[model samples]
Target chain A: LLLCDIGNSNANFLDKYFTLNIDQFLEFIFYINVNEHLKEHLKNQKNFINLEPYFLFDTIYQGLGIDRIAACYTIEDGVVVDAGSAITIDIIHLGGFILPGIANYKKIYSHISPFNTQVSLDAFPQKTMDALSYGVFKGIYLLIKDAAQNKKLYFTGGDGQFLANYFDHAIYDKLLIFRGMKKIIKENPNLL
Target chain B: LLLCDIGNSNANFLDKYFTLNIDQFLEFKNQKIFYINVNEHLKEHLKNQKNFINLEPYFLFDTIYQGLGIDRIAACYTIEDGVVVDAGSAITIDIISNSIHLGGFILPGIANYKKIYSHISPRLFNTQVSLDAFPQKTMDALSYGVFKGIYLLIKDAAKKLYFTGGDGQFLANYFDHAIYDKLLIFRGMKKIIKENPNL
Candidate 1:
């Protein structure tokens, strides 16, 4: 069967990593990873539970949920944003876009030494750290404003709720993905 | 006379480093010490203080403008329209709709960005630099992801786009309509000064 978790950065192995076939494997990945082996392994679909196919609405999945962003939002016709290791945006009833995550703002690489730091999520940033924080957010703000086109908005992911803070009527929840995962898992208890 | 720039991590020798890379830089004598403080507050007893000018704020008339520091003021500088992205310590993006200033956003810049990713993700820490068109490596994921996110953000937010700061020139190449203004903040200061000479 076909059972897996698909995301912009990585596709987690929720099928127990082919073990108890129920254990689960988690890890961020490259964009264009050739998962031919996994593809061939999942080719046979006798029974399975995956995150992708169910992203769209269905009888078992119900309405308004799934796809991390929509997996649990209590509303609709909004731009669903998942800001984490990568920022993925989807325009309900339209299309979606994906980009990098929030850490990029405070990404400190040292050629001379090994050191790193973080910054606050400020709208109008002043300090170097804060500026990066604000830039990270503002960039997405503009992103949603552009992609949303006056439509309502929703947020999830590492910095999803963070994005929610800046918008007016937008909503946020960390459990967006699992919410749908539950519905699907319930639909096919055999896999769980 | 000395000048330095502070960033996500290391701060000393910033001017020398930045100046070294620039084939053509601002050449002026009596320019002993130069420091561009991006923070709002100030520190005490530097090697020299006269050369360092904190980009503060004031009223250019009823508008009542303030320098959130020079780079920020550069972004605030009035323009046709769009988001001003200054890619440096923090890749700052200020939104300008029509003519009104709609504030802006902040996030870590290039080096800081890499640090955040690698430090948290142990696996990513040891990985070599990967540069895929989109995002095939750890840094690339963030590099392309956040960068694109911010780019589209400003692009969709404004009609005219502008670039500044360290990566300004490099990023400017991506857009057709985006203008890379090295001295945008200063230009903004001049514009504000035009009306209020006292500023």
Candidate 2:
């Protein structure tokens, strides 16, 4: 039995003992994202819906017996921002935007200067290094906070807690993606 | 007479023309050094020289922002209550309202952030990503995320936003009322020079 979760950055390969290769993922029924290109690679792979771009909205709508989340929520729609490796902000109705996650600022700062390792995510940083660290943090904070001005905001990812520091209305969960993954796994129990 | 503005990324040496050597700079006798440098190590060396004159961040009619770089202080010369963003190795954002200098914050610039994330992790560096509102791939998502994140940081504060530095023009493309000035620091330094000629 082999299981793999392939994302933009790295692919997590798991199983009874598990292997990291989604490419040669054979033997037993394997669960994978049903992306278009992956269909050509693994013939024995069992694709999941959570891998789709609109997985969150799709699951909520399918379960709640609704169409667009906008129809059920307060405003026309709601918004969710994934503030992880890349901060993805999308409307629950249609689509969204992505930014460099606050976590990625260290990676981003190393190009011009000799990488500053001692950076503080202070609200008002005293040093240049601290300023850079806090700047990216606040940038994403304002992005997620302000984007949810009149709409309901749901946040997830690595920096969700950090971002939630600024806004009072922001609702966050680290397990949103995991729960999303679980939804797909539970939906197709026959594959188990 | 010589003027040097050292920042996190590039160090500018301007006298008759621009040059970067600090040693050969002292080689010239009887030269007065009026400098604005943020790097602490180089600032330590500047402290040793008797002739070296470091520009104070604040004045009576004008206060030079300590956290903000020389490039950022120059943009405050503009008559508007807004944010002056100095884009470089690290981006600094300061708010000046009705000539009153408020505080500012700093963050990693796009190039620096991209380089950091890309080199450490392979997936974050999507060589194919461009600066867009929506990202299709993970690489583009990271690129757009950082770029757009910076954009959102400025847009909400005030209508009038000013920009400076190497990446200023590229980042300005996303802004609505962003005013870009390449020589903001020099203009600011020039203001200080005109004010105190006896020095």
Candidate 3:
């Protein structure tokens, strides 16, 4: 079982490359552009007799995999605010926010700031910084404020430090999405 | 027609003190005091005359006066992120946040800080310092020391810096790119009107 969490900025390919033993192995990769290298390596492997590749975001997660999982209708209610470059507020109310793992507040503000000069998260002093910080804070605050009755807040992104304090009660699962991917692969080993 | 804009902090009693028409005036006297003294004066004044007195935390425009041929209102607004120190007989710093009033502090101004230093440590006596850009060592230390102390105090509380009053220009240089709103009291008065159109 190889778990790979591929992201826009960096890719985390878990396990010792090609060292994992396999009676039948499944590879779940997302947003990774190393198609030729992976294909060539797989072709050369003697042990790689049968390989099942689930390309997430591109294929599997796009069509049947997500829909099939949705059809199960498990009410695993959760809130995921990936605070990266832009603060993406995703609510997993069955089929939640369409986009997953998107940029957060700082990213959105930087994108909108004139001349595209990146605003360092630490540049502004306390009160001024509060304008941007509390703005985003109040946003997530409102989302899970009432939803705490049933659901929980799950934050994952680059700027976890800023969002962590605001959500003391919620679980800060950094790799819930990746873990979910791994769970999907394990449950449906036949897909591999 | 005389207009007076008074607050808990200061009293701007603009009257015929400078230009007096002895025939028209019965008896006009201007008294200035600290906030505490002002409170006592208000009590004494209220007992003697039927003059209208305005209170804080209320809309200024609401203060009605009889025989008010001309009306004047004072509002406190446009308090940007900066330190506003009233460098008068006593030094006080009013730290503002954004355009809103987050409240401020009162501390010894440059002269008073120097006076205190002189009294406590005679070696520092007879050393007069001014708030100016390119301040000499003595002036720089005094100005920056007091300014920095207030700056840090306000900074610690997460407030911005704004300097007002006569000595504002001197301290303005210390802030360097910082905002110095000379008409803070006046602007603040105007802001009150803007925020509450009912005034």
Candidate 4:
């Protein structure tokens, strides 16, 4: 069974667990896609399966990303943080909040100030650059820590492993969405 | 006495209070214009003028690092013991204890916040909600998340908070004992000009 997770930038595929390409393989491919262009292109292919409907979690927030919904499916309890282009934190039954990713901090800060510093994990930083660094990372950490409340933390996406290190007991799995995709395929066995 | 605060976008004057585009040409009119400038363009244009007195040299506090905004230095100059929050194009939060600056940090201002949100998606552009727990809408979530993050950053100060700049009033309302002073930079400029009577 082949699994693919399509984002805005890249098409992440789980090939016995690695990453892409659609038509080269003969096996039936199950996928969760957030990219509209790729979804449109892959709609004509009979071998590719869109697993968006197969996922079993619902969200109250309007215009919540589908990639978020799939990530949240892996855990029954605890916070799921998908730290990609945007960092999205979703608590199991308590809802979640979204903020800009660390990569966009430069562009965001450049809009307001001349300084575009890197993110540093310092506590009570005394300098402007370090303060900004501590603020961006620690503020998000505090918010997620407060929401999680000792419940487990499920981290995924590109920057997932980096942020997970800050938490005491965070579970970092790069193929978390694929795990959700696998769960969906198992429940609806005859769908593909 | 002409007091001017030159920001990235505008040249704010205390001569009966008004703002002008920083790029616009202005005559100092024989009066010594005491100013704190953060705008590099305005600095290059007006630095050599005989009528303009740059307030950068007059700051009395010890700044912890380089690249500190002169306007931020001016704002910090006014406070003896409090948190000086200049919420302008960028939100600068400086700590002062017994006339000594303890250093500070910067966060993107509200306008920049909206711009970043808009970049994520055009639908996330507007923000008009309180910082309540677990907001349901995209607008509320962004608003709550942004404000909450800033709140956590400043809540530790636990001092007499002084708010200045454009978004000062909005942030001041968040704290119980915070005071909003729009003319904080001017006050600092005035304090400096008075001290340096020989200049």
lDDT preference between candidates 1 and 2, better one: 2
Worst 10 residues of 4 chain A by lDDT: A19-28
Ranked by TM-score, the better of candidates 1 and 2 is 2
Q: Give the TM-score of candidate 3.
A: 0.33
User: Looking at candidate 2, what is the lDDT of residue B154?
Assistant: 66
Model 2 per-residue lDDT tens digits across residues B21-102: 5555445445777877766667667788878787754433344435445556655655457777778766777777788766
Alpha carbon deviation, residue B50, candidate 1 (Å): 7.4
Model 3 / residue A30 / CA error / Å:
81
- The C-alpha stretches of model 3 lying farther than 4 A from their native spots are A1-192, B5-10, B14-38, B55-57, B60-76, B80-84, B95-103, B125-144, B151-161, B191-199
| Candidate 2 lDDT, A59-143, residue by residue in tens | 3111221111212222245777655445567665344455555545565445345623344334344456555655666566666
Tell me the tens digit of each residue's lDDT in model 3 across B135-178: 22333333433554444443443434555665666555645455
Which window of 10 residues has the lowest lDDT sum in candidate 1 chain A?
A: A25-34
Docking class of 1: incorrect
For model 4 chain B, give the 10-residue run with minimal summed lDDT. Answer: B120-129
Q: For each candidate, give its TM-score against the true structure.
A: 0.47, 0.64, 0.33, 0.88
lDDT, candidates in the order shown: 0.49, 0.56, 0.38, 0.75
Model 1, runs deviating above 4 Å: A1-138, A141-192, B1-67, B74-84, B94-104, B119-144, B156-161, B181-199
Output the TM-score of candidate 4: 0.88
Error of 4 at B55 (Å): 1.5
Sorting all predicted structures by TM-score, with the top scorer first, yields 4, 2, 1, 3
